[PDB]
Design a protein around this ligand. Structure first.
Ligand SMILES: OC[C@H]1O[C@@H](O[C@H]2[C@H](O)[C@@H](O)[C@H](O[C@H]3[C@H](O)[C@@H](O)[C@H](O[C@H]4[C@H](O)[C@@H](O)[C@H](O[C@H]5[C@H](O)[C@@H](O)[C@H](O)O[C@@H]5CO)O[C@@H]4CO)O[C@@H]3CO)O[C@@H]2CO)[C@H](O)[C@@H](O)[C@@H]1O
Ligand SMILES: OC[C@H]1O[C@@H](O[C@H]2[C@H](O)[C@@H](O)[C@H](O[C@H]3[C@H](O)[C@@H](O)[C@H](O[C@H]4[C@H](O)[C@@H](O)[C@H](O[C@H]5[C@H](O)[C@@H](O)[C@H](O)O[C@@H]5CO)O[C@@H]4CO)O[C@@H]3CO)O[C@@H]2CO)[C@H](O)[C@@H](O)[C@@H]1O
Lengths: 142, 142
């Protein structure tokens, strides 16, 4: 499902850009990365307070590592409506997370009101360099 | 299908930002707009030469207007692998366009090699101010 590319998704703090050549979106986390310093991110995610969503995704890491998968503000104060700590390994795991939104995020950045985003932050969790691959990422309301 | 926002999609040259409150992505084209001056765009679209794709979308315009719907380079020299002229009106029309790609676009901007994109350029086609709404946009390989 990344076989046509990121199509909106971007990464930052990675060694080289993201790679979708395999069909999955993959990124190389630099060794010695900093918390909040490396991420794979989709901005422009509108969220309605009270609505229930399920975030789905399949991921792999080339070292056994726990990271952070979230839905939140793209901008100060970086509030979250989903905040998790997925443990990842070599073998694909499908994560499914259901939540009811505790806040509203606009589809576009406004004054005092950053757009929402889906974020996988990857930095700071392992001293070592490692690779994350992502596939089958979906987010919908219930 | 825009009910959770643009999620990667962006607009430019519009009067105010894009709006997804209705479930469809909508944008207000300024009166007297310039060719190539107004658009709704998804960058990061990887394309493989020889591959066959179908671009789908449902659109409406608040004046009868023909625009440009394309898949091409996000960057000089702005080559295209699909180039069309959809006639749009008040009443929803689903367009389906099949093509075999005459070029390869990377998923990420490189040297001499801009990322690919899906683009609806809207400027320059009507002197009047008008609204475009978009829904059910999909692009896949056959
Ligand atoms: O080619 C595709 C497209 O690319 C555009 O350029 C991209 C570029 O490639 C990306 O690298 C860049 O990435 C930024 C993200 O958009 C943005 O969300 C992110 O924001 C982070 C911020 O980096 C981080 O410091 C912050 O950490 C906070 C935590 O979240 C909190 O929990 C904690 O308590 O506090 C810290 C703050 O210290 O988080 C935020 C939000 O997650 O920053 C990334 C790096 O800049 O985005 C560019 C724009 O999309 C290019 O421009 C297009 O032309 C092109 O088509
Ligand atoms: O909030 C979401 C996300 O937003 C990021 O910021 C966005 C911003 O909101 C957009 O307005 C901006 O839009 C640019 C497009 O990314 C980019 O593709 C587009 O490129 C156009 C160019 O504008 C145009 O001049 C050019 O026309 C050519 C034709 O295509 C050819 O046919 C013709 O022959 O020649 C002309 C040249 O004269 O076309 C290209 C490609 O279509 O430019 C838009 C305006 O800048 O993108 C920003 C980055 O995504 C924000 O940074 C994020 O933080 C945020 O999360």
């Amino acid at each position: 499902t990344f076989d046509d590319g990121p199509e909106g998704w971007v990464a930052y703090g990675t060694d080289g850009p993201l790679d979708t050549s395999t069909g999955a979106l993959c990124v190389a986390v630099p060794a010695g990365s900093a918390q909040y310093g490396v991420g794979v991110v989709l901005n422009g995610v509108a969220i309605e307070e009270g609505t229930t969503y399920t975030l789905r995704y399949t991921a792999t890491a080339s070292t056994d590592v726990t990271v952070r998968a979230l839905v939140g503000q793209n901008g100060a104060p970086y509030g979250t409506v989903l905040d998790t700590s997925p443990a990842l390994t070599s073998e694909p795991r499908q994560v499914t997370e259901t939540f009811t939104a505790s806040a509203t995020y606009p589809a576009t950045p406004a004054a005092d009101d950053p757009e929402g985003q889906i974020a996988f932050q990857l930095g700071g969790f392992s001293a070592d360099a490692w690779t994350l691959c992502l596939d089958d990422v979906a987010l919908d309301s219930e």
